[PDB]
Design a protein around this ligand. Structure first.
Ligand SMILES: *[C@H](C(N)=O)[C@H](O)C(=O)CC/C=C/C/C=C/C
Ligand SMILES: *[C@H](C(N)=O)[C@H](O)C(=O)CC/C=C/C/C=C/C
Lengths: 403, 403
């Protein structure tokens, strides 16, 4: 019935493992860079939240042949989570009570495009090859992890745009609550490519006025923010039943004391706020400790940023928690945002500190009053909240508490 | 705690509604046709499981402009399921206890390729437009339905390749069991295009030797089967808590008494009979009545067909149920296969008959002591089972029983 986190893995724009991420977080270090690929593609946004690691040879050649970047990022993340959790092969493999729930927001547009492009060339089917389905299918992230890691329990992906990996973790918790699984690896991944990013630029969702200063492009809550900075990477956490964790001597980061999942039923592409209030409130049912720190979805967009702050004002009233949008540092990894930010929250809980909300040269007028921390501040935290929202009015929030 | 089906909707290769689907199922009619598009793309497979329906003015302009075919098919299926359920706006909209869990196996390869092609054109960003993300994102099917139907409960997609809509329904059931939702619209959709179809052909998964006789291409269990026939369409069912349903005088097709979801942890693109055995066994746990009819996954592939059979023989041993692969008639709608086949099963339960397993000129010698029904058989059914498997070793089976 009770679910706790006993391990985490992460490959992000601000770090290739939790120690690197930790340092980046405390230093308010940016993971955004200039992208020549995005410029050459004809986009107006040339800033990236890229993973600085050459993944070549990092996975078994026979295994990696079926994977795309989103899967590769999640795979390396799950490798870290397994080790971190102190799980031995005999403990999680070929075990019906061990599952995997991980996904991405867009699967693999790069290979969807590669397949189409190849089909129309002089080689046709032979240029396409036999590995595009597993690379391009939406469930690639879960399929490519569950098979090599020898998982026998649940195996599927939850996809909900920019809230996918958050819903993935929440679903993992429910598996533990329903007593169906003892352990479920949850998280996700997202590739970084002009193929997909150009589609966000086309709808004006990406930042375009700070290409000369990449590290200043992502500026959540700043009066002059102008869209989010697309990013890629992966994240993975080990969701485990409490007794099972305690029995093996597992190191527990926190317990998942709240999980909200609601729907706006209003606008595609734009948030309503109303659904987020219900989502946060839902995650709070039963939680009687205060929310000490709130890791906002805050993507750095004009409408989104204040819409979520309005939701928070409504849920907490005159006693809102310390807030910070780590996306100002990391960028928006879309489908991987939820699990990565849950990890940043876990690291803050574990090391007792609040990561800064960077790049706010002029706090938005609507952000007046609120406690958005703009400096790395040491503090003993106990309960933390993390929000994730996506197109189609899909909301998710997770509340984690220290034991 | 108990989940029942109180409505269904369907847009498939063998019918644009449940009445038409019933007629083809009883008649043993094939929905496969020759495809000029497929042939013209360079493919070897030129047979289709297409939806014969002009969807043109069926969905509101400002709504449909965010959708792709998978979403359009699921949307029309939802419309039918709402009416067929006897539900009205005042009862299902802006209601926190009403949710939506629907997905596709591939999202929208067509619009993803369109975006990449548009971008590379002289007009770039302006050629792409602002609607490709919602059309191409993996969660499109759920996002595009939850918003217009004003859903306020759960809202996300489950994606598991050729088992997605089956896992979607199972997840909906768990929402009712966890007491989180009273109603959850579950199902999915899949578009039909060479963009995606060419990728399956490239891995030799599609039938190529019966292009001259499309209706004979899909031949599950036949000694000369040579791959599945790709198809498109949608399906949607209303999963409702028992008491809620009885209280409103709802029409109940049956109760979902079993739901299995397992993982092979062995092969990508190839089924390991053992995972399916555990999946089926998991779905039968607690069901005190025998399985009267089994709607197999049977896609008409050399390895797949008999592997599931070996799995079935191992599960039921001596006393096996009547079996029939409706894909021999309908083709493989991939992500939409699970929900559509659950609907065929519900229709057989609701009308007391077993749909034929067509096109078996020579029964595979692997399907021995089994009961593969090859003629529409009038029978009083009580408990039915439906299997769905996908790449990455993802398995799902649903057991539905009359109340
Ligand atoms: C991101 C957000 N609102 O924070 C939004 O939910 C979103 O667009 C996620 C979808 C990304 C998948 C890419 C599909 C493009 C082909
Ligand atoms: C189908 C099967 N094994 O019956 C298989 O699970 C599958 O390939 C489903 C994925 C289809 C999504 C298309 C993605 C291609 C870009």
């Amino acid at each position: 019935k009770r679910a706790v986190i006993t391990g985490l893995g992460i490959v992000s724009s601000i770090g290739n493992n939790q120690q690197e991420v930790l340092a980046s977080l405390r230093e308010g270090r940016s993971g955004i860079t200039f992208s020549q690929e995005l410029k050459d593609s004809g986009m107006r946004s040339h800033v990236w939240g890229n993973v600085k690691l050459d993944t070549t040879g990092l996975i078994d050649r026979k295994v990696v042949r079926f994977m795309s970047d989103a899967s590769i990022y999640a795979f390396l993340s799950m490798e870290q989570a397994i080790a971190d959790a102190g799980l031995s092969p005999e403990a999680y493999q070929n075990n019906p009570r061990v599952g995997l729930i991980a996904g991405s927001g867009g699967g693999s547009p790069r290979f969807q495009v590669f397949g189409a492009d190849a089909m129309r060339g002089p080689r046709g089917l032979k240029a396409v090859g036999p590995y595009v389905v597993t690379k391009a299918m939406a469930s690639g992230v879960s399929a490519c992890l569950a098979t090599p890691f020898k998982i026998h329990g649940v195996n599927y992906s939850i996809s909900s745009a920019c809230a996918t990996s958050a819903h993935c973790i929440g679903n993992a918790v429910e598996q533990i609550q329903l007593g169906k699984q003892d352990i479920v690896f949850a998280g996700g991944g997202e590739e970084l490519c002009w193929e997909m990013a150009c589609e966000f630029d086309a709808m004006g969702a990406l930042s375009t006025k700070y290409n000369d200063t990449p590290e200043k492009a992502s500026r959540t809550y700043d009066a002059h923010r102008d869209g989010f900075v697309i990013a890629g990477g992966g994240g993975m956490v080990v969701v485990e039943e409490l007794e099972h964790a305690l029995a093996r001597g597992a190191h527990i980061y926190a317990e998942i004391v709240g999980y909200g999942a609601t729907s706006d039923g209003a606008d595609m592409v734009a948030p309503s706020g109303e659904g987020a209030v219900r989502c946060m409130k839902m995650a709070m049912h039963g939680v009687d400790t205060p929310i000490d720190y709130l890791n906002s979805h805050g993507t750095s967009t004009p409408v989104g940023d204040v819409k979520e702050l309005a939701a928070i004002r409504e849920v907490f009233g005159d006693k809102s928690p310390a807030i910070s949008a780590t996306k100002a540092m990391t960028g928006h990894s879309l489908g991987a945002a939820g699990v990565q930010e849950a990890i940043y929250s876990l690291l803050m809980l574990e090391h007792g500190f609040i990561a800064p909300s960077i790049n706010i040269e002029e706090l938005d007028e609507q952000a007046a009053g609120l406690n958005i921390v703009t400096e790395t501040t040491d503090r003993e935290l106990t309960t933390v909240m993390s929000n994730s929202f996506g197109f189609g009015g899909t909301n998710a929030t997770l509340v984690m508490r220290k034991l």
